[PDB]
From Swiss-Prot, chain A:
Function: Component of N-methyl-D-aspartate (NMDA) receptors (NMDARs) that function as heterotetrameric, ligand-gated cation channels with high calcium permeability and voltage-dependent block by Mg(2+). NMDARs participate in synaptic plasticity for learning and memory formation by contributing to the slow phase of excitatory postsynaptic current, long-term synaptic potentiation, and learning.
Protein name per the record: Glutamate receptor ionotropic, NMDA 2A
Domain notes: Contains an N-terminal domain, a ligand-binding domain and a transmembrane domain. Agonist binding to the extracellular ligand-binding domains triggers channel gating. A hydrophobic region that gives rise to the prediction of a transmembrane span does not cross the membrane, but is part of a discontinuously helical region that dips into the membrane and is probably part of the pore and of the selectivity filter.
UniProt lineage: Eukaryota, Metazoa, Chordata, Craniata, Vertebrata
Glycosylation site positions: N42
Curated annotation (Swiss-Prot), chain B:
Subcellular location: Cell projection, Dendritic spine; Cell membrane; Synapse; Postsynaptic cell membrane
Stated family: Belongs to the glutamate-gated ion channel (TC 1.A.10.1) family. NR2A/GRIN2A subfamily.
Recorded disease: Epilepsy, focal, with speech disorder and with or without impaired intellectual development: An autosomal dominant, highly variable neurologic disorder. Features range from severe early-onset seizures associated with delayed psychomotor development, persistent speech difficulties, and intellectual disability to a more benign entity characterized by childhood onset of mild or asymptomatic seizures associated with transient speech difficulties followed by remission of seizures in adolescence and normal psychomotor development. Rare genetic variations in GRIN2A may be associated with susceptibility to schizophrenia, a severe psychiatric disorder characterized by hallucinations, delusions, disorganized speech and behavior, cognitive impairment, and social withdrawal.
Name of the protein: Glutamate receptor ionotropic, NMDA 2A
Residues of the full protein shown: 287 to 336 of 1464
Quaternary context: Heterotetramer. Forms heterotetrameric channels composed of two GluN1/zeta subunits (GRIN1), and two identical GluN2/epsilon subunits (GRIN2A, GRIN2B, GRIN2C or GRIN2D) or GluN3 subunits (GRIN3A or GRIN3B) (in vitro). Can also form heterotetrameric channels that contain at least two GluN1 subunits and at least two different GluN2 subunits (or a combination of one GluN2 and one GluN3 subunits) (in vitro). In vivo, the subunit composition may depend on the expression levels of the different subunits. Found in a complex with GRIN1, GRIN3A and PPP2CB. Found in a complex with GRIN1 and GRIN3B.
Originating gene: GRIN2A
UniProtKB/Swiss-Prot annotation, chain C:
Extracellular side: 1-408
Function comment: Component of N-methyl-D-aspartate (NMDA) receptors (NMDARs) that function as heterotetrameric, ligand-gated cation channels with high calcium permeability and voltage-dependent block by Mg(2+). NMDARs participate in synaptic plasticity for learning and memory formation by contributing to the long-term potentiation (LTP). Channel activation requires binding of the neurotransmitter L-glutamate to the GluN2 subunit, glycine or D-serine binding to the GluN1 subunit, plus membrane depolarization to eliminate channel inhibition by Mg(2+).
Organism superkingdom: Eukaryota
PTM note: NMDA is probably regulated by C-terminal phosphorylation of an isoform of GRIN1 by PKC. Its phosphorylated state is influenced by the formation of the NMDAR-PPP2CB complex and the NMDAR channel activity.
Family: Belongs to the glutamate-gated ion channel (TC 1.A.10.1) family. NR1/GRIN1 subfamily.
Disease: Neurodevelopmental disorder with or without hyperkinetic movements and seizures, autosomal dominant: An autosomal dominant neurodevelopmental disorder characterized by severe intellectual disability and developmental delay, absent speech, muscular hypotonia, dyskinesia, and hyperkinetic movements. Cortical blindness, cerebral atrophy, and seizures are present in some patients. Neurodevelopmental disorder with or without hyperkinetic movements and seizures, autosomal recessive: An autosomal recessive neurodevelopmental disorder characterized by severe intellectual disability and psychomotor developmental delay, involuntary and stereotypic movements, spasticity, and inability to walk without support. Intractable seizures manifest in some patients.
Residues carrying a glycan: N35, N177, N213, N250, N274, N324, N342
Boundaries of the shown chain within the full protein: 27 to 434 of 938
Amino acid sequence: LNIAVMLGHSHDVTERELRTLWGPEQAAGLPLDVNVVALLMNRTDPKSLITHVCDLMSGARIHGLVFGDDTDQEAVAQMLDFISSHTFVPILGIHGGASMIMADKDPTSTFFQFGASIQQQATVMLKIMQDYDWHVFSLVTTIFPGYREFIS
Amino acid sequence: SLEARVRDGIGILTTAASSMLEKFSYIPEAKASCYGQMERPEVPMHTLHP
Amino acid sequence: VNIGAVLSTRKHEQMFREAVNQANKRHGSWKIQLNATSVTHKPNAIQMALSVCEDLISSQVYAILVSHPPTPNDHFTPTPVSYTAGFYRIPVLGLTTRMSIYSDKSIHLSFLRTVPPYSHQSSVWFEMMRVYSWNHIILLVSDDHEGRAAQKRLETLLEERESKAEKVLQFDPGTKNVTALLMEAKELEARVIILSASEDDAATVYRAAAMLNMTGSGYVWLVGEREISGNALRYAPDGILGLQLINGKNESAHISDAVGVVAQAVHELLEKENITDPPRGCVGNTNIWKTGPLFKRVLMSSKYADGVTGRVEFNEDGDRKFANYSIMNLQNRKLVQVGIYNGTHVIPNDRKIIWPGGETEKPRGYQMSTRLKIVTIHQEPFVYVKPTLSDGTCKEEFTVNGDPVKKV
């Protein structure tokens, strides 16, 4: 197959061949044969993002592009999902931008994240509290998007 | 570190592709281009999402 | 200020220009006076998003208006504009989009609409419930975001009355056979149904329920607004109570109201402390607006009633509040109005309704069953258990004086 890789040019902005050097011999046999099309990115604009993804698609029969950003705009993920809802290619983010989980994605879109939702955070919280005998508390919340779900 | 994340993503994708191949191998290609005129949804089956 | 918009057809552009000219001539902000920009709904999805920048962000607009074209897609208009303008935190103003995924202000960031989305008709359902003394419902619901949101809203509203609905049965969207759930919903003690789903599912459930004699006497239905539309009006049982929005599929009044609100808000932002300019150019700048969130905050808090839509007052998540619903009823497959909803109160008309069946009464929503199922346990002299006799009857035993012993 083929699966392009894009990076945020922040941590590993060097040795693109090293990322291209995935699985020198194999990993566990490698029944299929895949090659990366690793492309370094730049400042991410919506028109720029769409044009890059579409043109890069129009090339080497592309598949689940593994996106990764360096900044924190909280919107790129949404934009990313949008593309994955109109072009049937999987997309899963790793670092930063495409890592803050949105509540409810579209039901005909293939897009996956690597973070943890609010429910898991609340579960870890209550597992910490239960382990130090702090069985009394009173949560306070502001008017911020998603407080109803957390309280519920 | 980030390299482990990229390795994990690539591995998960090739494993999903291998599962689809071992199931009913007919692996599709790119959907032409997204810059075209009209798109007619006629996907033969759930490609690799399930 | 170069306020643009994304309308449906070319004819509305002249009306938009006339409205903006009237607003500028009446009262506004000095700045560069006012202007307008237009673009049509291209049916290429992704392309449209790009075009937005190439015609609106490229001109450094301050607010974007989006309207629903008549193509049956239900999401075609608002999503691309909302996402693209939410990247830069610039606020948009939706005109006629009642879908309830947008009243979720954590994915769309900045999105204001001038028509209440569906679930407020569940609020109206509760208000109408109060005035007729009904206390037992078996409401059905879909399984997408719409149905879950409506059910959650109704449950939240009903929780304040220290009561609860009876059953909350639900089905997958776009099914083909439903009669299992409807058969399950028969042997209960409630006679009010608050069905709320899509048009095709509504037609399917109507056809399935017509064979179970559920449309007869004493079954008060309640159908909100979308399941008495085009297709669902074919198999509807005479006696339903459908709602509507008085100023619904209309654009002129909504365009005028949106222009008035936006102009009044702009005439208030310029007289402030810190003022910034729109981020002209789609490519290049990748930072949020310095006045974006403040612009949304000031726009949301704005009371103004001088246009032909009713009182305008955005609430909490900039959704809508204080709208008008015009109740109707179906007699001989002919919709007739029988009341008006003015906001937090209902107002009956001088017209007689006909419940399903055709009696002119107020069918009680309750029943009594009187078929209680009792469960026991084999233990002690309390409840004996003995193997039955193959003849059909247990036996005939006696006591100290030969008195018969009851057996079931």
